[PDB]
Write an enzyme that holds these catalytic residues in place. Structure first.
Site, short mmCIF file in Angstrom:
data_model
loop_
_atom_site.label_atom_id
_atom_site.label_comp_id
_atom_site.label_asym_id
_atom_site.label_seq_id
_atom_site.Cartn_x
_atom_site.Cartn_y
_atom_site.Cartn_z
N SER A 1 -0.88 7.12 -16.05
CA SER A 1 -0.06 8.19 -16.59
C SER A 1 -0.63 8.65 -17.93
O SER A 1 -1.21 7.84 -18.67
CB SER A 1 1.39 7.68 -16.75
OG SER A 1 2.20 8.58 -17.43
N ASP B 1 7.42 -0.77 1.20
CA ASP B 1 7.00 -1.31 -0.08
C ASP B 1 5.57 -0.94 -0.35
O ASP B 1 4.64 -1.60 0.15
CB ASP B 1 7.18 -2.82 -0.04
CG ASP B 1 6.79 -3.46 -1.35
OD1 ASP B 1 6.59 -2.75 -2.33
OD2 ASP B 1 6.69 -4.72 -1.37
#
Ligand code: NA
Length: 330
Positions: free
Chosen positions: A199, A35
Site C-alpha cells: 500500500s 481464505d
C-alpha cells in the site's frame, strides 16, 4: 468457464463469510470460508472426531461415487489465530458457483481445534493463496483456483465482500457492474505464498494522506485490518477514550463513539473504509467498551488487509503468469 457464488456473513459483525460449495456425486453442499491467506481446502467430515463436531455439515466420502482416497496423503495446518486442523485427503469433484473442478484435493479433518468446533456455521475452509503453502504431504496439492485456472475465461477471481450483507466471489471474469470508477492494479510478491502487496499510505478521517509503503497481504480469511503500531496509534488517537487493552487483547473504544474513516492507498488510488466498518461492538455482552476493527500487527510479523479493508473494495486476484491485485471502490 466461469463461476459466481454468493458469500454471506456468519453473524451480525461480519466475523467471517461462508460460501456454498458442492463436493462429490451426488453433491454434498458445505458452507466454506474462502481464505485468500491459506491454500488448503479442508472440510468437517465423517472422519472428524465426533466430540469435535457440533452442528457443522460434514462431507462423507463414502457417499460420493467420485471420491478417491489420496493414499498416504496427510495434512496439518495452523492459522494465525492459533486454530488448527489435520487429517487425510480424498480427491473429488468440487463446484463453486457453477464452476467445476474434477480431481480436487478435499482434505478431510480427523481433528479440529476448539474454535472450529465452537463455530457451527463454518464447515471448512477453501484456500485461495498460492499452492506453495498447501500442507498436504508427501505430495503437495493445488488450490481450487489453481486447478480451475486453465479452464477459466480469464485467470482471475474477485472478492466483493459485503458490510453487514452478502457479497460475491466470481471466478474467471471481472463484473464491470460491481464497482465504480476504475480498477487500480498493484504488484504482488508470491515469495511468502500470499497475495502480498505494498500500500502507498493512509489517512485517518478527513486528515492528510501520509505517503508511506506498507507491505501486507490481502486475506479474506482474517476478520480485521492489522497494520503497524504507528499507523494504528494514529487512528485510535482520533477516538476519545480509545486505548489498547492487554486484558482484552487490542484497541477498545467507547461504544458511544462515532469512528472516523480510514483510507489506504493503492498506487495513486484511495480506498476509504467507513468508520462504521471498524466497530466490532461490545467486548462482552452488555459492555460499553467496543472492540476496534483496526489493530496492531506488531505481534504477527506481517500486516494483514483482512475483511475490514477488503469489504470496502471490489478486489481482483489476478493469477496470470505475473500475478497482480486490483482494487476498485464500489
Ligand atoms: Na475477538
Amino acid at each position: 468457464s466461469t463461476g459466481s457464488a454468493t458469500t454471506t456473513p456468519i453473524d451480525s459483525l461480519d466475523d467471517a463469510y461462508i460460501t456454498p460449495v458442492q463436493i462429490g456425486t451426488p453433491a454434498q453442499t458445505l458452507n466454506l470460508d474462502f481464505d485468500t491467506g491459506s491454500s488448503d481446502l479442508w472440510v468437517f467430515s465423517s472422519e472428524t472426531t465426533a466430540s469435535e463436531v457440533d452442528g457443522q455439515t460434514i462431507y462423507t466420502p463414502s457417499k460420493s461415487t467420485t471420491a478417491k482416497l489420496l493414499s498416504g496423503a496427510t495434512w496439518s495446518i495452523s492459522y494465525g489465530d492459533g486454530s488448527s486442523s489435520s487429517g487425510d485427503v480424498y480427491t473429488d469433484t468440487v463446484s463453486v458457483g457453477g464452476l467445476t473442478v474434477t480431481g480436487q484435493a478435499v482434505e478431510s479433518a480427523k481433528k479440529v481445534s476448539s474454535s472450529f468446533t465452537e463455530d457451527s456455521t463454518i464447515d471448512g475452509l477453501l484456500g485461495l493463496a498460492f499452492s506453495t503453502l498447501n500442507t498436504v504431504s508427501p505430495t503437495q496439492q493445488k488450490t481450487f483456483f489453481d486447478n480451475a485456472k486453465a479452464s477459466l475465461d480469464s485467470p482471475v477471481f474477485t472478492a466483493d465482500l459485503g458490510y453487514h450483507a452478502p457479497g460475491t466471489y466470481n471466478f474467471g471474469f471481472i463484473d464491470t457492474t460491481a464497482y465504480t470508477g476504475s480498477i487500480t492494479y498493484t504488484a504482488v510478491s508470491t515469495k511468502q505464498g500470499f497475495w502480498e502487496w505494498t500500500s502507498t499510505g493512509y489517512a485517518v478521517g478527513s486528515g492528510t494522506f501520509k505517503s508511506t509503503s506498507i507491505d501486507g497481504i490481502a486475506d479474506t480469511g482474517t476478520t480485521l485490518l492489522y497494520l503497524p503500531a504507528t499507523v494504528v496509534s494514529a487512528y485510535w488517537a482520533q477516538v476519545s477514550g480509545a486505548k489498547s487493552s492487554s486484558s482484552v487483547g487490542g484497541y477498545v473504544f467507547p461504544c458511544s463513539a462515532t469512528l472516523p474513516s480510514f483510507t489506504f492507498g493503492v498506487g495513486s488510488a484511495r480506498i476509504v473504509i467507513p468508520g462504521d466498518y471498524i466497530d466490532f461492538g461490545p467486548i462482552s455482552t452488555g459492555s460499553s467498551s467496543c472492540f476496534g476493527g483496526i489493530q496492531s500487527s506488531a505481534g504477527i510479523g506481517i500486516n494483514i488487509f483482512g475483511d475490514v479493508a477488503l469489504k470496502a473494495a471490489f478486489v481482483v486476484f489476478n493469477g496470470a503468469t505475473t500475478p497482480t491485485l486490483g482494487f476498485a471502490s464500489k
